[PDB]
Design a protein around this nucleic acid. Structure first.
Ligand SMILES: NC(=O)c1ccc[n+]([C@@H]2O[C@H](COP(=O)([O-])OP(=O)(O)OC[C@H]3O[C@@H](n4cnc5c(N)ncnc54)[C@H](O)[C@@H]3O)[C@@H](O)[C@H]2O)c1
Ligand SMILES: [K+]
Ligand SMILES: [K+]
Ligand SMILES: [Mg+2]
Ligand SMILES: [Mg+2]
Ligand SMILES: [Mg+2]
Ligand SMILES: [Mg+2]
Ligand SMILES: [Mg+2]
Ligand SMILES: [Mg+2]
Ligand SMILES: [Mg+2]
Ligand SMILES: [Mg+2]
Ligand SMILES: [Mg+2]
Ligand SMILES: [Mg+2]
Ligand SMILES: [Mg+2]
Ligand SMILES: [Mg+2]
Ligand SMILES: [Mg+2]
Ligand SMILES: [Mg+2]
Ligand SMILES: [Mg+2]
Ligand SMILES: [Mg+2]
Lengths: 51, 58, 110, 39, 171, 71
RNA sequence: ACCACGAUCAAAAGGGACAAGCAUCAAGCACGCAGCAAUGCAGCUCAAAACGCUUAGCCUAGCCACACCCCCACGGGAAACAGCAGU
RNA sequence: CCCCACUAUGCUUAGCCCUAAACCUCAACAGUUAAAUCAACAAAACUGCUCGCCAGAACACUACGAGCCACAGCUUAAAACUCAAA
């Protein structure tokens, strides 16, 4: 009974983990979008200077 | 618990967890991410610790 | 279930694979310093039977006691490789990881 | 010292005590060879 | 080494670099640059060949490749400058730092550790368990103890046949 | 600070260097004898090994080298 | 009593644990593994102290060791109070 | 000590030797400026953490052992006698 309760507690913590990881991807994607934009301008600027 | 082997492992996985190995061969995985140290002690006491009655008898 | 070997279950790190079908495993235990009352690691070497020679130096293994020793120094067999060196599978999620980073996201399989 | 150093070195070891002229004994028997005075 | 005609890493992706005069191609090639520019081309070659993301320079793989290029440059430097103690120190320190990187990559990502070793031609070696001088007395004695062991093994095998032969005669 | 401790060390080292200077020919004869005994002690340690292993002579082709001579 | 199909007590064997000082004792020198065997592999211990030297009966409801000496005691040296009283 | 002459040597090349008052006489890393500011002087006073090192003076940058291209050497480094100081 205690092993089953521990397996159920792990499943509960896992559902919280999956919810926590989804919120981190949405934030990671936002950051990754800006960094790519910034990185693209810095490349285009660098490319124009070399051209 | 002087005769229970306790071994620690740093930064091997993304989240912290305890794993107990029993003489039967069973393994007990306890996820401890987000839990305080007091809750971790209370958790393993419940699932694998001797109750107060068993200790009083001894 | 009975065995003449004192250490029935022990976890350790493989530190040698140069013997045929035998892995040399360093097992550490916490030992209390009576004066300092601080715990320090105490390491002991165990030879473990590895029939399939699947143990690699550096992986964390679980050793089981044999009913009777099979050799002068071989009193255990490899029961399970807990953490394969550089190929760890996260037990909490079941996904492969490299240190504190996931190699496959837990969100892939929901 | 650090705790790790104190653990590794262990408890202090006293120097083995130096026996005196009686060799750690209260008295000794002796045979007089010569008598003289010292300054 | 990359060919001298190879363009610099900065001018390789400018539009129209293939239609410029030959003189302009010489001035933007490795031939007209210092050796450090050739090392940037070498590093990029190994990155594309080994790492999954050639633009991730902060991964443990990229650092091993970057340092492996520096290590090779020191070796070439010391081939011509054999009394340069400053760069001999930099080489030995760089080899030690890469071994630490390889140790940490082997423990965390073995599949990537194997690709780094194959790609860079590194034979990973485990460190010795003990660090102590092998002086003349020890070197000589250890050699004698191995010869004594080898001779004892031969004698023990000639005590198996004689016993076997005598046993057969009884029959 | 004063240099009184250095002065004690200074005289000890001067007198030692001078003592070694005066007796450098006796010390050289003593050092030669010690190296001979050191070589003999080394040869015995190797002979003990093959004798305790059951061999009656040194391994075939083995000659104990002189590991303490200047050469 | 006998059977004990056991309990108690407790050898041998196997696993584990177990004094002090000296590292100016730093290497030990066969100390490992696999195989039914043949035999094969070349390993095993060690600065987290191997190997070695020196010192000491011990953790005292008591235990260990010894029992004139050669660790042993067929044999030999030799003729034994470290049982009590005694010299 | 002062004057003159001249050598080893200071230079190069190739090997050694491996020492210094090799000393900011401040170990590495991280943190703090509020507590008591703090024996003194030096260089304002401290905390965390780790390694190295020390345990009266003198004997002793010594003896012996071991290692070393070192052989009038270097490294490691005691004890006995002695003192109530240093
Ligand atoms: N001696 C070893 O080969 C060795 C092996 C593993 C760990 N260590 C660690 O090194 C430290 C010094 O150990 P010690 O006091 O017994 O040696 P030590 O300083 O007395 O030196 C004795 C021997 O160990 C070597 N040694 C010294 N320092 C070492 C170090 N940091 N790492 C490796 N070898 C070293 C020396 O060269 C010599 O051969 C300790 O922290 C120890 O745990 C040493
Ligand atoms: K006896
Ligand atoms: K100074
Ligand atoms: Mg003096
Ligand atoms: Mg027994
Ligand atoms: Mg030491
Ligand atoms: Mg000595
Ligand atoms: Mg005694
Ligand atoms: Mg008697
Ligand atoms: Mg007897
Ligand atoms: Mg009596
Ligand atoms: Mg001249
Ligand atoms: Mg000049
Ligand atoms: Mg200076
Ligand atoms: Mg330091
Ligand atoms: Mg003193
Ligand atoms: Mg000196
Ligand atoms: Mg000296
Ligand atoms: Mg000497």
């Amino acid at each position: 009974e205690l092993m089953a309760w521990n397996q159920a507690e792990n499943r509960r913590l896992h559902e919280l983990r999956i919810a926590r990881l989804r919120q981190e991807e949405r934030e990671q994607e936002q950051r990754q979008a800006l960094e790519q934009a910034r990185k693209a301008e810095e490349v285009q600027a660098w490319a124009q200077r070399k051209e | 618990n002087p005769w229970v082997q306790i071994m620690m492992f740093k930064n091997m996985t993304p989240s912290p967890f305890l794993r107990f190995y029993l003489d039967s061969g069973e393994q007990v995985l306890v996820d401890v991410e987000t839990k305080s140290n007091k809750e971790i002690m209370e958790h393993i006491r419940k699932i694998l610790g001797k109750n107060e009655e068993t200790l009083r008898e001894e | 279930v009975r065995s003449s070997v004192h250490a029935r279950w022990i976890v350790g790190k493989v530190i040698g694979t140069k013997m045929q079908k035998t892995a040399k495993v360093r097992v550490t235990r916490l030992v209390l310093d009576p004066y300092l009352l601080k715990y320090f690691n105490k390491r002991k070497t165990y030879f473990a039977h590895d029939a399939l020679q699947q143990c690699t130096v550096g992986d964390i293994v679980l050793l089981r006691a044999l009913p009777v020793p099979r050799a002068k120094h071989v009193k255990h067999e490899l029961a399970e490789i807990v953490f394969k060196v550089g190929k760890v599978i996260d037990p909490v999620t079941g996904k492969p990881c490299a240190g504190t980073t996931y190699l496959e996201s837990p969100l892939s399989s929901e | 010292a650090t705790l790790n150093q104190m653990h590794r070195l262990g408890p202090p070891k006293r120097p083995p005590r130096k026996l005196g002229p009686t060799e750690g004994r209260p008295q000794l028997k002796g045979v007089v060879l010569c008598t003289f005075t010292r300054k | 080494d990359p060919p001298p005609s190879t363009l610099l890493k900065d001018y390789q992706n400018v539009p129209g670099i293939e239609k410029v005069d030959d003189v302009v191609k010489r001035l933007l090639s490795l031939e007209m640059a210092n050796k450090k520019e050739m090392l940037k081309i070498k590093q990029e070659q190994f990155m594309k060949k080994i790492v999954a993301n050639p633009e991730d320079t902060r991964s443990l793989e990229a650092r091993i490749i970057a340092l492996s290029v520096k290590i090779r440059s020191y070796e070439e430097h010391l081939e011509k400058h054999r009394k340069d103690k400053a760069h001999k120190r930099y080489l030995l320190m760089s080899i030690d730092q890469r071994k630490k990187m390889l140790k940490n990559l082997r423990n965390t990502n073995y599949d990537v550790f194997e690709k780094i070793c194959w790609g860079l031609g590194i034979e990973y070696t485990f460190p010795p368990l003990y660090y102590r001088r092998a002086h003349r007395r020890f070197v000589t004695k250890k050699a004698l103890c191995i010869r004594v062991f080898q001779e004892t093994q031969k004698l023990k095998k000639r005590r198996r046949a004689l016993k076997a032969a005598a046993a057969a005669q009884k029959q | 600070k004063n240099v009184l401790k250095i002065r004690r060390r200074k005289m000890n080292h001067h007198k030692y260097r001078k003592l070694v200077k005066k007796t450098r020919f006796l010390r050289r004869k003593v050092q030669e004898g010690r190296l001979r005994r050191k070589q003999i002690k080394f040869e015995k340690d190797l002979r003990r090994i093959w004798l305790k292993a059951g061999l009656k002579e040194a391994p075939e082709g083995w000659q104990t080298p002189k590991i303490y001579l200047r050469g």
